[PDB]
């Protein structure tokens, strides 16, 4: 029951909820459902947390992302 905060390179902010065990790949899928496959296709997504790139197969709980900071989604 965790909430990720996402910023795009168009100064847009938004929130995605997922379970701790769901992977970065599923975060990308949820971003795509929320923002569209035209502009945020899963394949083209790079998720950047604290200046480094999140890895598709890793459960999100494993990064211990504080809800204070944000994840940047780049394409």
């Amino acid at each position: 029951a965790v909430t990720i905060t996402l910023k795009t390179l168009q100064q847009q902010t938004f929130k995605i909820r997922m379970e701790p065990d769901e992977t970065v790949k599923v975060l990308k899928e949820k971003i795509e459902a929320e923002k569209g496959r035209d502009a945020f296709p899963v394949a083209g997504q790079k998720l950047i947390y604290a200046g480094k790139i999140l890895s598709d197969d890793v459960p999100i709980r494993d990064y211990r992302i504080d809800e204070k900071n944000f994840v940047v989604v780049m394409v």
């Binding site: 947390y49 480094k52 790139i53 999140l54 890793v58 709980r61 494993d62 990064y63 211990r64």
Partner: protein, 75 residues
């Protein structure tokens, strides 16, 4: 690989701990504390480890539980 986001230290520690606990007891014998701290690049001076044994296992149960371990080393 230089840009790959790293695991949170607490989650790496959880993984190590569970690995030393193949029966999923929730704890390790306190004789394994040295090995677990060395695997996690924590200070392993013998007398320091004996202070830590006593901080973590004040009741003298002879075991190190995961909760107290993460709380001391990876809060």
């Amino acid at each position: 690989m230089a840009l790959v986001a790293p695991e949170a230290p607490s989650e790496q520690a959880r993984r190590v701990f569970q690995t030393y606990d193949p029966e999923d007891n929730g704890f390790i014998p306190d004789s394994l504390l040295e090995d677990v701290m060395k695997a996690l690049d924590l200070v392993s001076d013998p007398e320091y480890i004996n202070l830590m044994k006593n901080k973590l296992d004040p009741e003298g149960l002879g075991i190190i539980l995961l909760g107290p371990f993460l709380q001391e080393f990876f809060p």
